[PDB]
Coordinates of C-alpha atoms in Angstrom, one line a residue:
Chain A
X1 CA 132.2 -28.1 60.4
X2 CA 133.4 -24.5 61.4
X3 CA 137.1 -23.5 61.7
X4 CA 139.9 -23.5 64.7
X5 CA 140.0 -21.2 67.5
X6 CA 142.6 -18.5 66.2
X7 CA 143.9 -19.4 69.3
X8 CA 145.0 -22.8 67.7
X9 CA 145.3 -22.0 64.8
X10 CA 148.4 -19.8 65.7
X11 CA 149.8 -22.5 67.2
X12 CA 149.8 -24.5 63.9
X13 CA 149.8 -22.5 61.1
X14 CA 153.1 -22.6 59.2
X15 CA 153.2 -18.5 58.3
X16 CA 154.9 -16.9 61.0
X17 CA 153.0 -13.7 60.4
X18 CA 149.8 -15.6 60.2
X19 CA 150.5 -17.4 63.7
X20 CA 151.5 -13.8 64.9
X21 CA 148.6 -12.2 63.7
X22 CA 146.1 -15.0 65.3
X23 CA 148.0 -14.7 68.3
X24 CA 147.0 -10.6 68.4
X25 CA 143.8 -11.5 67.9
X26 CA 143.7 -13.9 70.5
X27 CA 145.5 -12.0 72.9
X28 CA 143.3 -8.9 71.9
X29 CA 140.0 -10.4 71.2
X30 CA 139.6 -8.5 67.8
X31 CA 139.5 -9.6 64.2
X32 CA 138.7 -6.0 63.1
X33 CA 141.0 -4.9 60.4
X34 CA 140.3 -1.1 59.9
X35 CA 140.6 0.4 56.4
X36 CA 141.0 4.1 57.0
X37 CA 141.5 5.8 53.8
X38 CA 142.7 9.8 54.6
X39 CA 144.6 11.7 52.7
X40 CA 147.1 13.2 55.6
X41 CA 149.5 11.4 57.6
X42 CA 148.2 13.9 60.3
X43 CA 145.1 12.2 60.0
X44 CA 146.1 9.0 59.9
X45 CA 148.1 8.6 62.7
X46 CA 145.3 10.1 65.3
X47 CA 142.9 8.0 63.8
X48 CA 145.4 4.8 63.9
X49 CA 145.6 6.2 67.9
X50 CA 142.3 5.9 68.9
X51 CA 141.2 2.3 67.1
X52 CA 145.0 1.0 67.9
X53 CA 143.3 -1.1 70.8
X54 CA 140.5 -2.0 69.0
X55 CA 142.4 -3.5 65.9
X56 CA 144.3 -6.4 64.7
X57 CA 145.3 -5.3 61.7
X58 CA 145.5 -1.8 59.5
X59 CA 145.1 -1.7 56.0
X60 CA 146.5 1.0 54.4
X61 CA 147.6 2.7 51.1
X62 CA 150.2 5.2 52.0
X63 CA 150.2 5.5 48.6
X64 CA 146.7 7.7 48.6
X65 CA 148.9 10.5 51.1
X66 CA 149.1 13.6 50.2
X67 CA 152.4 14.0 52.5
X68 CA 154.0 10.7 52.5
X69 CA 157.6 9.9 54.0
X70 CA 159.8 7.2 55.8
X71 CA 160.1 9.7 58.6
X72 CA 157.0 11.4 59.2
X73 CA 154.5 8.6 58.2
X74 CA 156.4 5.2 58.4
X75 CA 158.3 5.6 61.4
X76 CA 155.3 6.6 63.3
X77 CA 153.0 4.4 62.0
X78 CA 155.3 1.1 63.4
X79 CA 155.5 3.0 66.6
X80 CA 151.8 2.8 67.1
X81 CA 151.7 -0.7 65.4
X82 CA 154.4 -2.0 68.0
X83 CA 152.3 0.0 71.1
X84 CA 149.0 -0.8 70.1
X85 CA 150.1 -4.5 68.5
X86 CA 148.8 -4.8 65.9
X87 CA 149.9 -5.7 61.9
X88 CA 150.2 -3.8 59.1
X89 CA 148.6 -4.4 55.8
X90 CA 149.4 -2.2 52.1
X91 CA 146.4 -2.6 49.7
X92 CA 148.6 -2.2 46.9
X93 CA 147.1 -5.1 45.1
X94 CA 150.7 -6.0 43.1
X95 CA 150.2 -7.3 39.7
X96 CA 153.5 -8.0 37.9
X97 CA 156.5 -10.0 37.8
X98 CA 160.2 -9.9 38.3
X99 CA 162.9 -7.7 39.0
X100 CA 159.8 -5.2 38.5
X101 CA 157.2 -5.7 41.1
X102 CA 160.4 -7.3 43.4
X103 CA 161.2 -3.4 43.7
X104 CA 157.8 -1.7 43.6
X105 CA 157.3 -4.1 46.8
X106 CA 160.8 -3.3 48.3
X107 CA 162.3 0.0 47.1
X108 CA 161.0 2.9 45.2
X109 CA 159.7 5.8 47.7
X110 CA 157.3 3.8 49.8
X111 CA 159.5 0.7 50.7
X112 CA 156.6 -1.2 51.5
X113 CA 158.3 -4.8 52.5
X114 CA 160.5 -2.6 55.3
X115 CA 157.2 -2.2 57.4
X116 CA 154.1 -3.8 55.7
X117 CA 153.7 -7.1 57.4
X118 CA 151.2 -7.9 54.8
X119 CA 150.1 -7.1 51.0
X120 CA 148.3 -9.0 48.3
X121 CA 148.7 -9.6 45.0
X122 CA 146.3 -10.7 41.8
X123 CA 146.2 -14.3 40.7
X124 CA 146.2 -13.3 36.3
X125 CA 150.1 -12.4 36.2
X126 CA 150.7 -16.1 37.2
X127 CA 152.7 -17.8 40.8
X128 CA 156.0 -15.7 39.7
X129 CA 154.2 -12.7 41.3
X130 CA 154.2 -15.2 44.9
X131 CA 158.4 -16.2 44.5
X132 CA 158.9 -13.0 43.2
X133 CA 157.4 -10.7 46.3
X134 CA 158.7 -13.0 48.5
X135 CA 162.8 -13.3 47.5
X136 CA 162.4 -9.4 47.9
X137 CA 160.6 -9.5 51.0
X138 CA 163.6 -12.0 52.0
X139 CA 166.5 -9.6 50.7
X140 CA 165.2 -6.3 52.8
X141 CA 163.8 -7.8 56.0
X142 CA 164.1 -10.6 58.9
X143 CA 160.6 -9.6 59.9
X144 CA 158.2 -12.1 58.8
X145 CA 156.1 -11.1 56.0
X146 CA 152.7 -12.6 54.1
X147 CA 150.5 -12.2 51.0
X148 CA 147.1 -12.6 50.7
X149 CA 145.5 -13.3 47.2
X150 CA 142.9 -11.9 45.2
X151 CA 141.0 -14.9 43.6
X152 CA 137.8 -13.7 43.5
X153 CA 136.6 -10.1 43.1
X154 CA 133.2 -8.2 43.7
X155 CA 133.4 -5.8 41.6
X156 CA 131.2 -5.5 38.2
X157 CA 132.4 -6.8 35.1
X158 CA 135.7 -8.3 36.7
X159 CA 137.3 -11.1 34.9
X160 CA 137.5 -13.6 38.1
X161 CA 136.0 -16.6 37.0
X162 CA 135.3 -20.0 38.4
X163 CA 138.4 -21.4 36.5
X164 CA 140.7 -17.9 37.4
X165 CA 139.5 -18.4 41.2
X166 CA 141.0 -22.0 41.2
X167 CA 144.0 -21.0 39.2
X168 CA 144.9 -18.2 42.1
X169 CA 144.1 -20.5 44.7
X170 CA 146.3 -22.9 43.1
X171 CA 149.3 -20.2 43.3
X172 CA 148.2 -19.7 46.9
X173 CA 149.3 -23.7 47.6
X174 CA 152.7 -22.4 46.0
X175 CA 153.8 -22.1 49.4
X176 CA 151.8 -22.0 52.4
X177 CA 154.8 -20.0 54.4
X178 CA 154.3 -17.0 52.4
X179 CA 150.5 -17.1 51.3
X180 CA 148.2 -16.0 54.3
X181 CA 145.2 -16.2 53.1
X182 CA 142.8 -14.3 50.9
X183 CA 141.0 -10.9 50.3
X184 CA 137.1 -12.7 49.6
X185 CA 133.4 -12.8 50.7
X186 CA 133.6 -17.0 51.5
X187 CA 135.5 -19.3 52.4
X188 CA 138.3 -20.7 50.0
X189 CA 138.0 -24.3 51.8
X190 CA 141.4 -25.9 51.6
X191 CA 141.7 -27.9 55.1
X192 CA 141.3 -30.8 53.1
X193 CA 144.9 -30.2 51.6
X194 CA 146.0 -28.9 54.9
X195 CA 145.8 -25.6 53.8
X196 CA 144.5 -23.0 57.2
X197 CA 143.8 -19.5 54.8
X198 CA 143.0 -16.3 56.5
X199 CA 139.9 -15.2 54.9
X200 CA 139.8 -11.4 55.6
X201 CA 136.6 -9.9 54.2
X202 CA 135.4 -6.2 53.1
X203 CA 132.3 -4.7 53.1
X204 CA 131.0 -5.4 56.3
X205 CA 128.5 -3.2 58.6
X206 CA 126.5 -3.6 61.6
X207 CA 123.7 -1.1 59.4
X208 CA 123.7 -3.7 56.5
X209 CA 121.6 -0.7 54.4
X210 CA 124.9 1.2 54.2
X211 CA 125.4 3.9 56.6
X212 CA 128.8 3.8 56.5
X213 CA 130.2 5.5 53.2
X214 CA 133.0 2.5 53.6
X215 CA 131.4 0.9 51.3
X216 CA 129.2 -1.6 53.2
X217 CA 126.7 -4.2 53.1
X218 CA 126.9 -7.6 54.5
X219 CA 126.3 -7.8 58.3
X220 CA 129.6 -9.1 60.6
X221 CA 127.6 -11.8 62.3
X222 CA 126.5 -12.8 58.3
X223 CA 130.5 -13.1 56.8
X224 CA 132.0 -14.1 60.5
X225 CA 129.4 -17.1 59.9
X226 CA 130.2 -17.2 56.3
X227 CA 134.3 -18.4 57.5
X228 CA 135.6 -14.8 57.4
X229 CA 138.2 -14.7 60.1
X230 CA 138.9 -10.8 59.6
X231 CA 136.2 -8.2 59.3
X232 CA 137.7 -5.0 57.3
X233 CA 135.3 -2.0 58.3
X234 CA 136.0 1.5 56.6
X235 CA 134.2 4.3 56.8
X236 CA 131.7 3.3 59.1
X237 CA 134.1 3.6 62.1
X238 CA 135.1 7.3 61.6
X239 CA 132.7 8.4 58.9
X240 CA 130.6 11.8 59.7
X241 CA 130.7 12.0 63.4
X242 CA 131.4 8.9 64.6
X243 CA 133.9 8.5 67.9
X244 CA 136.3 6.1 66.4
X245 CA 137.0 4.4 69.8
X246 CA 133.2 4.2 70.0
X247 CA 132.9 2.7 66.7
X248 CA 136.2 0.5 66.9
X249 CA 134.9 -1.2 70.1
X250 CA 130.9 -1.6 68.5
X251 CA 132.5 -3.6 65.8
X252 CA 135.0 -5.5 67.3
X253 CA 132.5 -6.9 70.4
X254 CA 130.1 -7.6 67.2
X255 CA 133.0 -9.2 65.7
X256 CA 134.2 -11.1 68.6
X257 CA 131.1 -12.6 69.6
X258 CA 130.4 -13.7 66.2
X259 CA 133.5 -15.3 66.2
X260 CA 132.7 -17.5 69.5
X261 CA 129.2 -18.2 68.4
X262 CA 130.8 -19.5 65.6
X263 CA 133.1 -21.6 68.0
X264 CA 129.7 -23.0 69.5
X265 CA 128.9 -24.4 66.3
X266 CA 128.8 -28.6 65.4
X267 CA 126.5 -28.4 62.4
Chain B
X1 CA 145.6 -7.5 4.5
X2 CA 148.4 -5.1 6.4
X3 CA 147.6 -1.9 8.4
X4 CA 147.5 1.6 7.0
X5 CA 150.4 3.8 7.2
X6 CA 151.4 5.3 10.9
X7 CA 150.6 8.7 9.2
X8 CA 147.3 7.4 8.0
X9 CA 146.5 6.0 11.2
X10 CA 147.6 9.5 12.9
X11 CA 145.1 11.2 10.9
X12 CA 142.3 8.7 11.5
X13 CA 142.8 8.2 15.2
X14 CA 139.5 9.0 17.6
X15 CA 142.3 9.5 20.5
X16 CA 144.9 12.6 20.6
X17 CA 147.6 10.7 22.5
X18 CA 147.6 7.7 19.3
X19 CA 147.4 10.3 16.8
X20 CA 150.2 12.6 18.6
X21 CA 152.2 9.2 18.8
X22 CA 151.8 8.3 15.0
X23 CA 152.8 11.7 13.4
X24 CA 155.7 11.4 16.1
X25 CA 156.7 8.0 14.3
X26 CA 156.1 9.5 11.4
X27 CA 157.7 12.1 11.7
X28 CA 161.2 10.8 13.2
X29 CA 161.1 7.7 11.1
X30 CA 160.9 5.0 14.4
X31 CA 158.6 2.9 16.1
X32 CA 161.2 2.1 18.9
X33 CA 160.1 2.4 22.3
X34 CA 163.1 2.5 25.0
X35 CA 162.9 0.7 28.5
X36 CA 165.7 1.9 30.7
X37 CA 165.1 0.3 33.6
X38 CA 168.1 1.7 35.6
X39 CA 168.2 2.9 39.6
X40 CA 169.2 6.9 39.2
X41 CA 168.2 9.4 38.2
X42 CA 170.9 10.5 36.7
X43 CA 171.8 7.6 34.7
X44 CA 168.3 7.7 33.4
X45 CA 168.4 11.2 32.4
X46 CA 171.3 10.7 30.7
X47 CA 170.2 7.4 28.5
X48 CA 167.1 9.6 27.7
X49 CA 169.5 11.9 26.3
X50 CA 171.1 9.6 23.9
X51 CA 168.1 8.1 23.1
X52 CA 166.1 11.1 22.6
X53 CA 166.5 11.1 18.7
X54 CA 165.8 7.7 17.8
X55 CA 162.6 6.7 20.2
X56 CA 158.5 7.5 19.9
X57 CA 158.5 6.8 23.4
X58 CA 160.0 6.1 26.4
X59 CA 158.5 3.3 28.8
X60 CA 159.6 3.7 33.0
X61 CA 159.3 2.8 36.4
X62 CA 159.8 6.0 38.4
X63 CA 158.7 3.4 41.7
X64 CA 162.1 1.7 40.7
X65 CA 164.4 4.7 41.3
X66 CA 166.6 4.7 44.0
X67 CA 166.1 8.6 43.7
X68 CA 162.7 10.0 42.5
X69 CA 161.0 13.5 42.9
X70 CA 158.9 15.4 41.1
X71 CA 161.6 18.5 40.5
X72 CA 165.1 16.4 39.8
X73 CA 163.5 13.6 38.2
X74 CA 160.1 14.2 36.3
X75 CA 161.0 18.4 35.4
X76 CA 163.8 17.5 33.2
X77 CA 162.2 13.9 31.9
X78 CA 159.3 16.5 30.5
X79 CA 161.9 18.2 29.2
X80 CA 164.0 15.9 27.3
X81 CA 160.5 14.3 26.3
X82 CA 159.5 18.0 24.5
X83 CA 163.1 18.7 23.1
X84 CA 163.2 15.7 21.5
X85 CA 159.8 15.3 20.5
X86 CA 159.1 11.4 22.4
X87 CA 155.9 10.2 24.8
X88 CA 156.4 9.4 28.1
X89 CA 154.5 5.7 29.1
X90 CA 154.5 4.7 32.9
X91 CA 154.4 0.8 33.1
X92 CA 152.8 1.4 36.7
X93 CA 149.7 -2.0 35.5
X94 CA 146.9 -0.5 37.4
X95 CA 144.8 -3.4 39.1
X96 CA 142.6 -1.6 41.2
X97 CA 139.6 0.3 41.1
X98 CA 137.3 3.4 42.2
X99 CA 138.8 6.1 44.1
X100 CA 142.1 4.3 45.0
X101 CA 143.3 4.4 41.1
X102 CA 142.1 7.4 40.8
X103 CA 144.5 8.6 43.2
X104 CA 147.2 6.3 42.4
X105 CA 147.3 7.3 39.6
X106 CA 146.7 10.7 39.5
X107 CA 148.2 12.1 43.1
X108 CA 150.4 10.2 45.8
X109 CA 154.1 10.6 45.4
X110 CA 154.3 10.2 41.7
X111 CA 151.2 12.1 40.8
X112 CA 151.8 10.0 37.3
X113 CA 148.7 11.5 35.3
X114 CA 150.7 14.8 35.9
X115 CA 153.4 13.9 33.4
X116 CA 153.1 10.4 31.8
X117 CA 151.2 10.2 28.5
X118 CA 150.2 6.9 28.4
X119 CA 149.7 3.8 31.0
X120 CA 148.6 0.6 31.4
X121 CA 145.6 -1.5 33.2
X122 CA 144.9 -5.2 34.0
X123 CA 141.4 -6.5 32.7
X124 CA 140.4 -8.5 35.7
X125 CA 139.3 -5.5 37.9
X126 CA 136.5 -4.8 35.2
X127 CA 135.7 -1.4 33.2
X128 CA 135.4 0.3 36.1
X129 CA 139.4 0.7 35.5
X130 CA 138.8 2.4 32.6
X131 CA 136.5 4.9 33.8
X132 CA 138.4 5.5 37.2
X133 CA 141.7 6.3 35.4
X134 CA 140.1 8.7 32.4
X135 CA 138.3 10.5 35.1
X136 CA 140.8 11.0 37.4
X137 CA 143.0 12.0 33.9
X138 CA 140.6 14.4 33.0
X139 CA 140.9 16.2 36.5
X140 CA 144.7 16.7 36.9
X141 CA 145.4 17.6 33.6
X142 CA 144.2 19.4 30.0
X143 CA 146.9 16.9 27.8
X144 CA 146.0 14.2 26.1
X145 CA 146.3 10.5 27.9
X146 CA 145.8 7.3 26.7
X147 CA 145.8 3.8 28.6
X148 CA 147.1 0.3 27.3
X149 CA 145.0 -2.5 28.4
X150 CA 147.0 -6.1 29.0
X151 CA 145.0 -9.0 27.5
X152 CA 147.2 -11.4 27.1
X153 CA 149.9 -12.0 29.7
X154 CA 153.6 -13.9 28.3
X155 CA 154.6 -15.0 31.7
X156 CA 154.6 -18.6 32.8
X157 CA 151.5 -20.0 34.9
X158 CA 149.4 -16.7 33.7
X159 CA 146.0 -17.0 34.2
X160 CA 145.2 -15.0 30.9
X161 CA 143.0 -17.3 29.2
X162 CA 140.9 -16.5 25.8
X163 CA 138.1 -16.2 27.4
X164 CA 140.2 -13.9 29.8
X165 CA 141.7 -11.7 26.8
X166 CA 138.3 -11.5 25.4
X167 CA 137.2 -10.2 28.0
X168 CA 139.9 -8.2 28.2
X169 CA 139.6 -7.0 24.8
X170 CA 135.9 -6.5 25.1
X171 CA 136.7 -3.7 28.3
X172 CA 139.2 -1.9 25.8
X173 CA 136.4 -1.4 23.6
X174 CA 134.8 0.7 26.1
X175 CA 136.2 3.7 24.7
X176 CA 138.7 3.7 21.7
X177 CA 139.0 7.8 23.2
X178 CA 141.3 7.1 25.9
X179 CA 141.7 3.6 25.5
X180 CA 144.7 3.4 22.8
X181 CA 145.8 -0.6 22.5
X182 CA 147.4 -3.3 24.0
X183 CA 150.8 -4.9 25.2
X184 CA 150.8 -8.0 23.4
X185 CA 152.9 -10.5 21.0
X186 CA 150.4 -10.5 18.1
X187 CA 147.5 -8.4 16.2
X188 CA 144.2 -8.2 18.6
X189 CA 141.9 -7.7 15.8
X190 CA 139.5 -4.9 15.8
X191 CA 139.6 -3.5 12.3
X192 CA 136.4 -4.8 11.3
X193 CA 134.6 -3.1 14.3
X194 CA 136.0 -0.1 13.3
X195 CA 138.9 -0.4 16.2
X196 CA 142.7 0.7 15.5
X197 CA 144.3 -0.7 18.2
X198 CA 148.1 0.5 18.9
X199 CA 150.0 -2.9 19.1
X200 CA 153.3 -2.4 21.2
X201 CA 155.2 -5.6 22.0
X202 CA 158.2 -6.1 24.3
X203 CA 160.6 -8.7 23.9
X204 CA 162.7 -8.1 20.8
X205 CA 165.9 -8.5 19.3
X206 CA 168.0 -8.3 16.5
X207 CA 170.2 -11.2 18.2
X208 CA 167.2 -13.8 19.0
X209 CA 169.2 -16.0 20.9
X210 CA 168.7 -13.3 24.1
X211 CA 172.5 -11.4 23.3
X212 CA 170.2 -8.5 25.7
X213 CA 169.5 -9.1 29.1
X214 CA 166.5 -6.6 28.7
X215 CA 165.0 -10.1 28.3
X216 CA 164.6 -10.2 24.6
X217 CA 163.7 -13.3 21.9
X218 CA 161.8 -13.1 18.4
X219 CA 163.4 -10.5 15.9
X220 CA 162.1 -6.9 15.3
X221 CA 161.2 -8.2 11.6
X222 CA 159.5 -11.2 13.0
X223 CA 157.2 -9.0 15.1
X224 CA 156.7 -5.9 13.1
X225 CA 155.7 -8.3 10.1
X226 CA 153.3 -10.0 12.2
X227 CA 151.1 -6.4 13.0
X228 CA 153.7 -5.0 15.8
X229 CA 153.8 -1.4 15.8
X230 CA 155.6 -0.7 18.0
X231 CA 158.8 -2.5 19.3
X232 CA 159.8 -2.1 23.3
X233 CA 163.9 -2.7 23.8
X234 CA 165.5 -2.4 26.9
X235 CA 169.1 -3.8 28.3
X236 CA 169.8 -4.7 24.3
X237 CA 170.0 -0.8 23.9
X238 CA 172.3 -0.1 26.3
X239 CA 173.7 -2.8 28.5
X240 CA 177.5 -4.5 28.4
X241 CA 179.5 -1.3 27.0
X242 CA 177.1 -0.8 24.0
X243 CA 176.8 2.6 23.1
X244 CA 173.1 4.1 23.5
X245 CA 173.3 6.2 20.5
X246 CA 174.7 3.6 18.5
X247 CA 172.5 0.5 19.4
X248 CA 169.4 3.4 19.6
X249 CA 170.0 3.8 15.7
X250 CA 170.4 0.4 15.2
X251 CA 166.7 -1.1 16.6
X252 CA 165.2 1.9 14.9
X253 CA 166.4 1.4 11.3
X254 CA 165.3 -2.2 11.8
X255 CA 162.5 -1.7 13.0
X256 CA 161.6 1.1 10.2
X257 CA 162.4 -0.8 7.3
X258 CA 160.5 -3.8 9.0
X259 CA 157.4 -1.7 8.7
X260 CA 158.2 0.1 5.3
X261 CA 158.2 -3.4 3.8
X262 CA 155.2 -4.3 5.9
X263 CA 153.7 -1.7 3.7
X264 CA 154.5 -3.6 0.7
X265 CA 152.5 -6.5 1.2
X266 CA 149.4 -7.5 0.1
X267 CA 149.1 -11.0 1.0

């Protein structure tokens, strides 16, 4: 009843970025997405150093910098991403249509479709957002690129209901080239269709309680169960003390062997 | 069965940026908002210019220029913006949450709470929006901001149901301090609640057929009749050779005498 080795998955999956990501964590033996959310470039890039091994994919919001640029942040950030291998992943959680977000995706000051391999967008502004970000993507690049989307949020009070979930998931079938996957706490099913969706999951910790200021509270071996394929961890790899190479390899062994207990499974 | 007056409404208003907004429409006769969605800089500052007379407000995308920086771009903005008495309103659509809002809103590149009087927020990511953003307002700067919410989306394949915009509508009634009213195509209620919502629609023309490729279709009479208060024109205003000062004059007697006779109904 459980999922594909990512190992076979990326040999199937119609998203080039999705087979290339499955085939980093394969090749790797992570799915550990690290969130790390500092305000200097300075900081970023010796953090990104020392989890670069440890990682599959960063998400990131350059936008939170206090010292952003093309030269001193971008360019070194792919460097580590193409010596490290691993992807690249702006939380900038796009909601608009158009000529509008087809810019705020590609141009502006961040450029984010030049070097993001991955973003996500919100389900409400209707599958315009899905053709829209990817013509742009399209225009500026040769470099695969991949959205996931957010169908189902956590947080109080949000609007996401039953009947928005299935109308984002529905914009997700728009195209399976472009639409990874999504940003949620459970599987999104879909195999039925023929549909293989990344489920990337926040929150998670190996101190459920919430040691890690990340924001966590579900265990990895609890979501990695659940159908998560990626764990993101924030905080609680860097947070107060921690050796991030310490932290980056304690999550992804966790992670890992999650994952092939999972691989055990028959029901 | 009509609203009040703008400069009833001015004097009434439980939020400073609404109440400086209504004696500035007041004042200068015009409930035209401008869009100038251009690339530069340059041409932007120099639309501005023309504009400057006849507009309450100016609606942008900073993340769209091909150019942007805090000294060449938002310095003389602010200035045009106090010489010829007009609010500036970012159409950034916040849909996040927490301390990422607060910072993408407030600092990053375009450190928009800095400068731009008014925004606008999805509904989906729940209250918390609303709190995050008039925080993070109250900590960069002393002016007055106000946000917009979006409950009700025009776009095909939106997921911006009733129950949706309700919601929606229900978040904006968090705080009628900082939030200020909505994007929308029709009146959102409130009055009976005690709520005087700012109604600001885009959309409009005084050639229906879509003469403006700022993407315009119903008339400024049809809308402002209908509860508009304010009416957003883009390309119409200064796309194909037409003269900015000319077709700036043009939407805001239109739209003025629309709302003058909108004060002479009764039902």
């Amino acid at each position: 009843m459980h999922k594909a080795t990512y190992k076979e998955r990326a040999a199937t999956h119609p998203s080039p970025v999705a087979a290339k990501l499955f085939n980093i964590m394969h090749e790797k033996q992570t799915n550990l997405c690290a969130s790390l959310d500092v305000r200097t470039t300075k900081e970023l890039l010796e953090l990104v150093e020392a989890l670069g091994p440890k990682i599959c994919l960063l998400k990131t919001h350059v936008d939170i910098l206090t010292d952003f640029s093309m030269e001193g942040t971008v360019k070194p950030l792919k460097a580590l991403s193409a010596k490290y291998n691993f992807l690249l992943f702006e939380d900038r959680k796009f909601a608009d249509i158009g000529n509008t977000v087809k810019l705020q995706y590609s141009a502006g000051v961040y450029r984010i479709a030049e070097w993001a391999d991955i973003t996500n967008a919100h389900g409400v502004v209707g599958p315009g957002i899905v053709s829209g970000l990817k013509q742009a993507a399209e225009e500026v690049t040769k470099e695969p690129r991949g959205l996931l989307m957010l169908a189902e949020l956590s947080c109080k009070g949000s609007l996401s209901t039953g009947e928005y979930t299935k109308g984002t998931v529905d914009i997700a079938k728009s195209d399976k080239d472009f639409v990874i996957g999504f940003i949620a706490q459970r599987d999104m099913g879909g195999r039925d269709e023929g549909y293989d969706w990344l489920i990337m999951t926040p929150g998670v910790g190996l101190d459920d309680k919430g040691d890690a200021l990340g924001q966590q509270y579900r265990t990895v071996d609890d979501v990695v169960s659940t159908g998560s394929d990626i764990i993101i961890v924030g905080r609680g790899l860097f947070a107060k003390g921690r050796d991030a190479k310490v932290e980056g390899e304690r999550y992804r062994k966790a992670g890992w062997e999650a994952y092939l207990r999972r691989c055990g499974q028959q029901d």
